Amino acid sequence: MKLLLFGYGNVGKAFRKLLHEKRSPELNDVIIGGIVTRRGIMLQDKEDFTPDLEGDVFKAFEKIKPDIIVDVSSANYNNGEPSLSLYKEAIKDGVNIITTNKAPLALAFNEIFSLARSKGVKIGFQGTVMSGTPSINLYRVLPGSRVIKIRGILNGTTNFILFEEALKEAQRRGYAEEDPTLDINGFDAAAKITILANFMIGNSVTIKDVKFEGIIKLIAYADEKEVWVKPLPISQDDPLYNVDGVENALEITTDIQSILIRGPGAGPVNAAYGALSDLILLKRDCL
Amino acid sequence: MKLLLFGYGNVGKAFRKLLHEKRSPELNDVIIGGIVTRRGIMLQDKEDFTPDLEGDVFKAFEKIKPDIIVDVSSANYNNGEPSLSLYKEAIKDGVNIITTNKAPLALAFNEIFSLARSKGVKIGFQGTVMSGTPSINLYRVLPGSRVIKIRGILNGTTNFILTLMNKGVSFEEALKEAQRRGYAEEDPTLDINGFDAAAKITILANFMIGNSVTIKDVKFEGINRDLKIKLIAYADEKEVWVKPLPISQDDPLYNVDGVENALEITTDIQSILIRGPGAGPVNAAYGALSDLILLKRDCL
Ligand SMILES: NC(=O)c1ccc[n+]([C@@H]2O[C@H](COP(=O)([O-])OP(=O)(O)OC[C@H]3O[C@@H](n4cnc5c(N)ncnc54)[C@H](OP(=O)(O)O)[C@@H]3O)[C@@H](O)[C@H]2O)c1
Ligand SMILES: NC(=O)c1ccc[n+]([C@@H]2O[C@H](COP(=O)([O-])OP(=O)(O)OC[C@H]3O[C@@H](n4cnc5c(N)ncnc54)[C@H](OP(=O)(O)O)[C@@H]3O)[C@@H](O)[C@H]2O)c1
């Protein structure tokens, strides 16, 4: 099976490295047919990017005919393109999608997932929320339960900050978005809670419906009625108390119980492992 | 598909109820063919147990010919029986197993899982560790990652007793409350003396680290009134233990209080912690139900 790798920054390079470490027997048949950046299309799996052709992700898609697209490109919160149009075309063609790019999902979740479900196409999106720490995929192992509310710390960069020296270290460590105002001004946290509300609660929201601010903890919240992101004081008994540094946490409340998962919120290798986890699950037919 | 339900105490009853809530489309073809207690065999799905036949779990297996056994019976750490021999017969007959009963897996994990792998039979065992809080099933969504070490509070009953004693309640009243809530093992010495926690860390070491250990390999102690102290379980590639330890304020496990449990899993990629209710009949039954749905999805 052939992957098209869309993006080759820190996450894309880390993903290619993880694939080549041969971490699961069911990835033995998986090859990268092509890699696309802003600089063009490489129709080969190489450690170093050198373009073979000029052209965008649609040209690469037509040239390669991939079985799966792995989207690790920059978030475009303006309109989610070209990923939004690309996912739609891939789903129509029966091409599975694995993504760490929040933007098309933060803007158009219902449109994308409705189309996928109607076509029997699978979407892996673990890396969009808390990188490699099961979040999306945690919910996959909570079947037959109704999610009532969601609460968490969903942005790694800003939690690591909690100024100029802090950010600089975070950018050095690769935690930050290419546009780091997306981290600071809360877009990233709001995108993640949007994705979580859609998937787990079923509350069809876009990032436009979320009330949010920026950088006590930056708390993202969703229930059946509302979705928001705001700073709040935290109790000592509250399980979010000492989720500090790059750490992120997701508290899922159901009809049965409340559970919390905590882990590294950001980090290119962690994000890439999220996408890799989705790939293994796809291969097992468990997405 | 037909289930044989082995046991009908708090967990079994809660499981039956959850199945009847029809919580997933995967479960539409799933029926209980029989329920076994130490009072005999009920060849019917009913809220209250009344035996139709006298006989043990083996006789029930023969009479029902189930597609799946759900083991919610009492732990037997002396020898894991009759569950251990039952699992071996089931696997050989192509019968899948879902269990919340730790004993056979704490004694003979490699034997059971080797036999199962060879026959292509699936084993759900989420409920053996932290009830309905993904633990076993959390590791299922961490594929292609090597587990280096694990540390946690793995017994709800003793955590609940430690917390209440910190709140100035006697050990004796804290235990009675744990029992009233249905947190405790039928034999509460299994919780108190650390057997239950040791069983769980054994299972995790086997499943996640891949070392073929048994409960006899674990150095463990439990709790008493004489001792924040937390009953800490730990495993890595070289050692497995359970002991009550003083816990500092900055430790992620400091505020894991009451019946809450928590597991920190360190992989080659990352360190993660999951926390939630350690015990509770409905929580345990939900663990088993989660395994059932995953089994139907072919994702065990
Ligand atoms: N950083 C983290 O820790 C983390 C954790 C979870 C999720 N994520 C998500 O993962 C994604 C990638 O993160 P990253 O840190 O790897 O960013 P990055 O290092 O800037 O990589 C972005 C890659 O996408 C390519 N790209 C961007 N826009 C494109 C376009 N219009 N056409 C073709 N290629 C394009 C870039 O090409 P050039 O090489 O030519 O610039 C670059 O190779 C982001 O969406 C982010 O939100 C990141
Ligand atoms: N307590 C929790 O919240 C929790 C959480 C996770 C896992 N678990 C595990 O789940 C299991 C069941 O828990 P529970 O609270 O439901 O215990 P329980 O209330 O004591 O129920 C045990 C059931 O098994 C039956 N049984 C025991 N030995 C048997 C034998 N040799 N043959 C036939 N039937 C037998 C009992 O029959 P009678 O009714 O006739 O006595 C009873 O119906 C235990 O292994 C426990 O470790 C419990």
Q: What is the DSSP string of chain A?
A: -EEEEE--SHHHHHHHHHHHT--SGGGTT-EEEEEEETTEEE-S--SS---SB---HHHHHHHH--SEEEE-PPP-TTT-TTHHHHHHHHHHTT-EEEE---HHHHHHHHHHHHHHHHHT--EE-GGGTTTTSSSHHHHHTSTT--EEEEEEE--HHHHHH--HHHHHHHHHTT-S-SSTHHHHTSHHHHHHHHHHIIIII-----GGG-EE----EEEEEEESS-EEEEEE---SSSTTTT--TTEEEEEEEESS-EEEEEEE---HHHHHHHHHHHHHHHHTT--
Is A80 annotated in some ligand binding site?
no
What is chain A's Cα-based Rg? 18
Angle between helices B195-204 and B103-119 (to 10 degrees): 20
Breaks in chain A (C to N > 2.5 A) come right after 162, 215
Q: Is A162 exposed, middle or buried (0-12, 13-18, 19+ CB in 10 A)?
A: middle
The owner of tokens 């001792």 is: B227
Is B11 annotated in some ligand binding site?
yes
Rounded Cα–Cα distance for residues A18 and B197 (Å): 35
Rounded Cα–Cα distance for residues B216 and B198 (Å): 9
**Cβ(B53)–Cβ(B40) below 8 Å:** yes
Distance of CA A39 to the CA centre of its chain: 23
> For a pocket test of ligand 2, which of B61, B72, B137, B286 has the largest count of ligand atoms closer than 8 A to its C-beta?
B72
CB distance A141–B134 less than 8 Å? yes
**Cβ(B64)–Cβ(B97) below 8 Å:** no
**Cβ(A113)–Cβ(A88) below 8 Å:** no
Q: Is A120 exposed, middle or buried (0-12, 13-18, 19+ CB in 10 A)?
A: exposed
* Residue B298 token pair: 């072919």
**CB of A242 within 8 Å of any CB in chain B?**
yes
Rounded Cα–Cα distance for residues A189 and A211 (Å): 11
Rounded Cα–Cα distance for residues A87 and A80 (Å): 10
Size of interface A-B (CB pairs under 8 A): 114
Residue B58, φ and ψ in degrees, nearest 5: -65, -45
Residue A152, φ and ψ in degrees, nearest 5: -170, 170
Residues with CB under 6 A from ligand 2: B 7-12, 36-39, 56-57, 72-75, 82, 100-102, 127, 131, 182-183, 185-186, 279-281, 284
Rounded Cα–Cα distance for residues B3 and B54 (Å): 19
* Residue B54 token pair: 């006298």
Catalytic residue among B13, B200, B230, B296: B200
Give how far A79 is from chain B: nearest CA, Å. Answer: 31
Rounded Cα–Cα distance for residues B213 and B116 (Å): 18
Method: X-ray
Rounded Cα–Cα distance for residues B265 and B70 (Å): 27
What is chain B's Cα-based Rg? 19
Rounded Cα–Cα distance for residues B154 and A29 (Å): 39
Where do the structural domains in chain B lie, given as residue ranges? 1-143+277-300, 144-276
| Catalytic residue IDs of A | 192
Q: Which residues pair with B135 in a beta bridge?
A: none
Q: Which atom of ligand 2 is nearest to the CA of B190?
A: 47
* Residue A254 token pair: 């159901």
Rounded Cα–Cα distance for residues A8 and A64 (Å): 17
Rounded Cα–Cα distance for residues A194 and A221 (Å): 9
Q: Which-ligand-closest: CA of B178?
A: 2
Give how far A76 is from chain B: nearest CA, Å. Answer: 28
**Cβ(B127)–Cβ(B287) below 8 Å:** yes
For residue A143, give the chain B residue with the closest CA: B290
For residue B276, give the chain A residue with the closest CA: A259
Residues 6+ apart with CB under 8 A from A180: A157, A167, A171
Q: How many of the other CB atoms lie within 10 Å of CB of B182?
A: 17
**Cβ(B34)–Cβ(B66) below 8 Å:** yes
In whole angstroms, how far apart are CA A23 and each of A15, A126, A268, A283, B160? 12, 18, 18, 13, 39
**Ligand 2 mean position, distance from CA B75 (Å):** 7
Nearest in space to A147 (alpha carbons), one of A86, A202, A91, A214:
A202
* Residue B158 token pair: 């003793």
* Residue B196 token pair: 């239950």
Half-sphere exposure of B80 (CA within 13 A, CB side): 21
Breaks in chain B (C to N > 2.5 A) come right after 227
Q: Which residues pair with B1 in a beta bridge?
A: none
Rounded Cα–Cα distance for residues A99 and A274 (Å): 9
Residues 6+ apart with CB under 8 A from A175: A156, A157, A160, A246, A265, A266, A267
Start-to-end CA distance of chain A, whole Å, equals 17
Q: How many of the other CB atoms lie within 10 Å of CB of B55?
A: 15
Residue A157, φ and ψ in degrees, nearest 5: -50, -55
**Angle at CA A11, nearest 5°, toward A5 and A15?**
60
Residue B112, φ and ψ in degrees, nearest 5: -65, -50
CB distance A145–B23 less than 8 Å? yes
Residues in B closer than 8 angstroms to A144, CB to CB, are 18, 23-24, 27, 289-290, 293
Distance of CA A201 to the CA centre of its chain: 18
* Resolution of the experimentally solved model in angstroms: 1.9
Q: SS3 for A79-148, per residue? A: CCCCHHHHHHHHHHCCCEEEECCCHHHHHHHHHHHHHHHHHCCCEECHHHCCCCCCCHHHHHCCCCCCEE
Nearest in space to A197 (alpha carbons), one of A229, A149, A230:
A149
Residues 6+ apart with CB under 8 A from B122: B96, B97, B116, B295, B300
**Angle at CA A100, nearest 5°, toward A94 and A103?**
90
Nearest to B293 among A138, A143, A284 (CB): A143
For residue A256, give the chain B residue with the closest CA: B283
Q: SS3 for chain B, per residue? A: CEEEEECCCHHHHHHHHHHHCCCCHHHCCCEEEEEEECCEEECCCCCCCCCCECCCHHHHHHHHCCCEEEECCCCCCCCCCCHHHHHHHHHHCCCEEEECCCHHHHHHHHHHHHHHHHHCCCEECHHHCCCCCCCHHHHHCCCCCCEEEEEEECCHHHHHHHHHHHCCCCHHHHHHHHHHCCCCCCCCHHHHCCHHHHHHHHHHHHHHHCCCCCHHHCEECCCCCCCCEEEEEEEECCCEEEEEEECCCCCCCCCCCCCEEEEEEEECCCEEEEEEECCCHHHHHHHHHHHHHHHHCCCC
Is B8 annotated in some ligand binding site?
yes
**Cβ(A242)–Cβ(B114) below 8 Å:** no
Rounded Cα–Cα distance for residues A9 and A15 (Å): 10
Nearest to B298 among A23, A262, A285 (CB): A285
Residues in B closer than 8 angstroms to A258, CB to CB, are 276
In whole angstroms, how far apart are CA A75 and each of A116, A281, B208? 21, 24, 35
Q: Which residues pair with B147 in a beta bridge?
A: B267
Q: What residue type is assigned to position A194 of the chain? A: T
In whole angstroms, how far apart are CA A172 and each of A17, A168, A224? 20, 6, 38
Nearest to B144 among A140, A142, A276 (CB): A276
* Residue B259 token pair: 């019946």
**Cβ(B201)–Cβ(B279) below 8 Å:** no
Q: Which atom of ligand 2 is nearest to the CA of B6?
A: 34
In whole angstroms, how far apart are CA A166 and each of A163, A172, A184, A187, A217? 5, 10, 12, 19, 16
